[PDB]
């Protein structure tokens, strides 16, 4: 562990210090003599250096500990962001991603200092010097009250300065992230900036971004350099006090030449170890804060949701406050205005929300109470825009789970004439967000993950968008098909040949939550 | 080297200054001064104030020693602000010279990427090659330059030992940081390869959330995550140790070579002539220092150099295949267009084409035409800076009254700040329909004098989306007079007029 090590460490440098200060008294006190037999010149070089190939030993063995610990809990509080950032309501997701993004990617990787070089500098500060004032005490008493008298002024000038570093920690967090986050959407949208002439007027906001972050690193980097260089100084008149007491008191010859120089040499070993914890306290303070804002982010509480499971076979769907009824086997088409919480219906039917309008209730129990893993396993959600990542057409047809049957429901759909005018087949590589592929391939492309798959409701979000009028009735015939295979389907379509396909037409209007 | 495609890369977007630079290395020289200076005037008590009481001289040491630590300290603290200050400058210009490659790109190429490798390759990676700068440039030139002079100087007394000091010297300061590289770039390719997986599940799981979730998917996007964050750290680890203990090992080079220094000094050095004492003390002690600080370097080497690598291979992307000819359209000043077709046949491809026809290439600054692609972005901005990306010299009574004829008058009336509501998540702030019309809107605030819209009736209302088109569509409806429109669409009224360059 830390400690071991660390007593290792601090007993092998107080050892050495010793050492080397008996030898050179020994030669100081018999310059050409004792050659020839107990020379004391070259039998303790080899102590030394075994005490310091062991202190060597220690420090790498502590630096793997530390190194391996490090990476666990950064792993550890990482899963913990984004267990709880990515599974909480879309509003509050959008809300707060893009600030979960960043501590995740680059702000909790600032945690290694803290592990591997703060931790172990703090232990050793607190085992090595009390150590050193002991032994130097014992070996000579008034250099080590002498030398105590300018202890207390590092801490205090420490507790000053973390004082007058927390604040812009935070303010350096908030900026990194405020710029990744603007970075990442200016790249997201630069084919619309280039389509409209404008691109080269988003490179001058980058570099204002740029600047921002690079005048706030310089003015911490200022800070945290010029406190090493008061702490440097510090110690250096601390060990230059003792360093004249004990040279006055040597010169009138008062005290002992080897007592004089174990306390010159284990003076600067009660102040180094407090130089290593203020060198080592502004490294940790970026990950510190990182942490703050990750647990911050994790401290939010989630809506409860119980335990209860719908029947087998296709449930019953009621909305009582819009008198809609979606029974199985039939299509229910739901319309409105652009805005009337339609989406949000489906999202509240999914139990990703809050039901806009009223309670929602599956095959007599409700949608709040019900087990959400086990009824999502029941339902083939098809939202506006499905998920297209980069990479191939294959690997983005088996993005959301596996397709039994690929092969039938590309054929239903119209997939099957999509990939065979494609070069490469379904090995073609896809930009971000589907680009390679046109608007209504993308369509059927999310049509063949939603459509075929084991499932007994289907919710579809506009599901023949971009699509002409033969594929459109094509589509329309497959989900139909789809119903009277004994299925509750909620198509959210409000054109003709969508209103004109289903059983059952809900008009939900306005004034429900927002309009 | 001088052709290698990596040197070029980061000469360009790490556009260094040669000011910075050297001046980096005389205050490094310079900072070696103290050590020179230690012993270099108050050796014994001969050299300073001839011969002295033993307090006066005990004083005299022990304010020398503090005015040369005052000294070194304030010289370390400007060297440390000066490189911090140029790993910065070089860190940013950097960025902004990837965007601005990104930018100047066609679009498509610009979308090969996830979210998660932008994000790893605009961070730690631009941070690897500012730091190859400060690191890979400082502590090498000092230590090339400081060998080659202590060589050259003891030429002079011992060329034959000057022979044997500087084969050790090359010696350890070759097989020092030959060990570091060799360790560190195998490893430093497996960790960046790992790093820049990690966050591609993960944000993955950050952008699409709802979606895994429903379909049962975001637990596995969660644990590849968490693999490859286990992969990165033990890659990590592995880099760490040898280039660790090839470090150390100068350290104990260090040691030996000023013990037998020391010893050597004592053997009849005062006599003949003192200054080779402190000759004695500047060599090796300068030398071994710059190879301890080498192998730090030769890792930064390796790791800013995969750095490099990933930026390039970033920058310059593999093409895609090319988008079908499509036959040329004549357009007149103040036509109205219905291009239709099936869902394969190329409409946005032949919009695309007629607008670059239009604009004829560059060198034509007053750009004639401009495509609405339905896909466009909605940024993470205010409604006004949203609807400002076409024309940003638009008064606000201009957007008022463009977004209360595209039907959203209601829907900005209803806004907490108005024109300045922040939209957070872009177009997942608002609805499919309402974002349709934005888009709309944008077109109408434009000053282009030919508009070219892709499904611009898409996902809107069952009463207003006819309306819209037929006012599209209408030589004085929302376009009027000057303006040509060319519309590609799915839902064409089929009783209607305009003419029709329906595709294949
Ligand atoms: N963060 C948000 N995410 C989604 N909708 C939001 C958000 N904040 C506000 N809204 C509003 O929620 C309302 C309901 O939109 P919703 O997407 O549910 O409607 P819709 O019936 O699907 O309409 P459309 O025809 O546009 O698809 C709209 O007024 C929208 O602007
Ligand atoms: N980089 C690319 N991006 C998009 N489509 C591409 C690309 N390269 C080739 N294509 C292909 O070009 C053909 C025409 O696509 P385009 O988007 O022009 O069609 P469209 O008529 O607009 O169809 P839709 O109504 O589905 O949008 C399609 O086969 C499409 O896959
Ligand atoms: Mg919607
Ligand atoms: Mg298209």
Redesign the interface.
């Known amino acids: 562990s830390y400690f071991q090590s660390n007593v290792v460490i601090a007993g092998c440098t107080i050892a050495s210090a010793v050492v080397l200060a008996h030898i050179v008294a020994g030669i100081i006190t018999n310059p050409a003599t004792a050659l020839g037999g107990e020379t004391d010149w070259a039998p303790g ?1 080899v102590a030394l250096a075994v005490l ?1 190939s062991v202190r ?1 030993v220690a420090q ?1 063995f502590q ?2 500990l530390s ?2 610990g490090a ?2 809990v ?2 550890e509080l ?2 913990q962001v ?2 709880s ?3 909480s309501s ?1 509003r509050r ?3 707060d ?2 600030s ?2 960043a501590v ?3 702000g909790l990787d600032g945690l290694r200092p803290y592990f591997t070089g703060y931790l172990p500098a703090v232990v050793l500060a607190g085992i090595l010097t009390p150590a050193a004032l002991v032994v130097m005490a014992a070996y000579d008493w008034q250099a080590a009250a002498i030398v105590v008298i300018a202890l207390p002024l590092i801490p205090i000038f420490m507790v000053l300065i973390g004082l007058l570093t927390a604040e812009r920690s935070a303010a350096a967090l908030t900026a990194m992230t405020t710029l ?24 001058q906001r ?2 204002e971004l ?2 921002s ?2 005048r706030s ?2 003015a911490t ?2 800070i945290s ?2 406190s ?2 008061v702490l ?2 510090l110690a ?2 601390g060990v ?1 006090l003792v ?2 007491s004990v ?2 008191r040597l ?1 009138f010859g008062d005290m002992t030449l080897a007592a004089g120089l174990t306390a010159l040499l284990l003076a600067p070993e009660v102040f180094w170890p407090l130089r290593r914890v203020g060198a080592a306290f502004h490294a940790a303070q970026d990950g510190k804060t990182a942490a703050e804002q990750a647990l911050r982010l994790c401290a939010e509480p989630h809506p409860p949701t119980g335990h209860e499971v719908v029947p087998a076979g296709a449930p019953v769907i009621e909305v009582p406050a819009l008198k809609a009824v979606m029974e199985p086997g039939r299509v229910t088409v739901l ?1 409105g ?3 009337v919480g339609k ?1 949000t219906l489906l ?1 509240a039917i ?1 139990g ?1 929300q809050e039901s806009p309008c009223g309670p929602i209730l599956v095959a007599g129990v409700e949608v709040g109470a019900l087990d959400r ?1 086990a009824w ?2 029941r ?1 083939a ?1 098809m ?5 297209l ?2 990479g191939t057409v294959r690997e983005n047809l088996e ?3 596996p397709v039994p049957g690929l092969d039938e429901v590309c054929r239903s759909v119209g997939f099957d ?2 990939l065979g ?1 494609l ?1 490469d087949g379904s090995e ?2 896809l ?3 589907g ?2 592929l ?4 993308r369509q059927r492309l999310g049509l063949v993950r939603a459509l075929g798959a084991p499932a007994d409701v289907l919710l579809l ?2 599901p023949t ?4 009028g ?2 459109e009735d094509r589509v329309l015939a497959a989900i139909v098909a789809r119903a009277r295979a004994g299925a509750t389907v909620v198509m959210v379509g ?2 003709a040949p969508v209103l004109a396909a289903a059983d059952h037409v809900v008009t939900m209007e306005s004034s429900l939550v ?2 | 080297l001088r052709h290698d495609p990596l040197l070029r890369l980061t000469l360009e977007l790490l556009r260094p200054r040669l000011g910075r630079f050297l001046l980096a290395a005389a205050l490094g020289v310079l900072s070696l001064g103290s050590a020179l200076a230690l012993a270099g005037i108050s050796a014994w008590l001969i050299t300073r104030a001839w011969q002295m009481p ?2 006066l001289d ?2 005299v040491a ?1 304010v020398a ?2 005015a040369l ?2 000294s070194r ?2 010289l ?2 400007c060297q ?2 000066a490189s ?2 140029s790993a ?2 070089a ?2 210009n950097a ?2 010279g990837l ?2 490659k ?3 790109a066609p ?2 190429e ?7 490798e ?3 390759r ?3 990676a631009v941070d690897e090659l500012a730091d190859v700068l400060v690191r890979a440039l400082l502590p090498i030139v000092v230590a090339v330059v400081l060998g080659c002079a202590a060589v050259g100087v003891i030429a002079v007394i011992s060329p034959a030992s000057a022979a044997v000091l500087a084969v050790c010297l090359v010696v350890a300061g070759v097989v020092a940081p030959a060990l570091a590289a060799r360790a560190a770039h195998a490893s430093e390719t497996v960790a960046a390869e790992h790093r820049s997986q990690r ?1 591609t599940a ?17 637990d596995s996007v ?1 644990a590849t ?2 693999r490859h ?2 992969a990165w ?1 033990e890659a ?2 592995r880099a ?2 040898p280039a ?2 090839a470090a ?1 090992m100068p350290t104990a080079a260090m ?1 030996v070579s000023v ?1 037998g220094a020391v010893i050597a000094g004592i053997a009849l050095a005062p006599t003949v002539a003192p200054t080779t004492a402190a000759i004695l003390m500047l060599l090796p002690l300068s030398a071994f220092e710059a190879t301890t600080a080498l192998p730090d370097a030769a890792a930064q080497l390796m790791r800013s150099r995969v750095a490099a690598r990933r930026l390039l291979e970033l920058t310059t992307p593999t093409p ?2 090319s988008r079908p000819d499509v036959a040329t359209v004549d357009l007149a000043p103040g036509d109205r267009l219905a291009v239709v ?4 046949s190329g409409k ?1 491809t032949m919009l695309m084409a007629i607008a670059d026809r239009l604009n004829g290439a560059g060198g034509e600054t007053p ?1 004639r035409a ?8 909605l ?2 901005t205010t409604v006004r800076d949203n609807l400002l ?2 024309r ?1 010299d638009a008064t606000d009574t201009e957007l008022v009254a463009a977004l209360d004829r595209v ?1 959203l008058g ?2 900005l009336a ?1 806004l907490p700040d108005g024109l300045s509501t922040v939209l ?6 608002v ?4 974002r349709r ?1 934005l888009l709309i809107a944008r077109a109408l605030i ?1 000053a282009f004098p030919v508009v070219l819209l892709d ?1 611009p009736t ?8 006819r309306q819209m088109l037929e006012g599209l569509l209408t030589p004085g409806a929302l376009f009027a007079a000057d303006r040509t429109v060319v519309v590609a669409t ?2 064409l009224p089929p009783g209607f007029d305009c003419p029709i360059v329906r595709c294949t």
């Open positions: 070089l310091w060597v790498w630096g793997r190194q391996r990476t666990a950064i792993g990482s899963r984004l267990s950032v990515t599974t879309p997701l959008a809300a991603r893009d979960a993004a995740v990617t680059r990744q986050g603007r970075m990442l959407d200016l790249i997201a949208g630069i084919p619309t900036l280039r389509a409209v002439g404008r691109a080269g007027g988003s490179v980058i570099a740029s600047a972050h690079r690193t310089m980097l200022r350099f010029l090493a260089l440097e100084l250096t008149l230059a360093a004249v040279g006055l010169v319309t205005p652009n805005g989406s999202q999914l990703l893993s999502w396993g339902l959600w939202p506006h825009r499905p998920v990542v980069p993005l959301l789970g004439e999509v005018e070069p073609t590589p930009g971000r967000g680009v390679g046109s608007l209504g391939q979000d506009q968008a971009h699509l002409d033969a594929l409000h054109r927002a309009p | 033993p307090v005990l004083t022990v020693v503090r630590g005052i300290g304030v370390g603290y440390r602000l911090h200050d910065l400058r860190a940013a960025r902004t965007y601005r990104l930018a100047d679009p498509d610009a979308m090969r990427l996830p979210s998660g932008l994000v790893a605009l961070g730690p966050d993960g944000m993955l799981a950050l952008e699409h959330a709802p979606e895994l979730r429903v379909s049962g998917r975001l969660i995550f968490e964050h286990r750290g990590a680890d760490a140790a660790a203990v150390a040691g013990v895609l295949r077709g099936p869902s394969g946005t750009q401009a495509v609405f692609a339905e896909d466009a972005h940024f993470d990306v076409v940003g039907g209601e829907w209803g957070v998540g872009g177009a997942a702030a609805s499919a329909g309402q019309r434009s499904q898409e996902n809107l209302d069952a009463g207003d989306a799915h839902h």
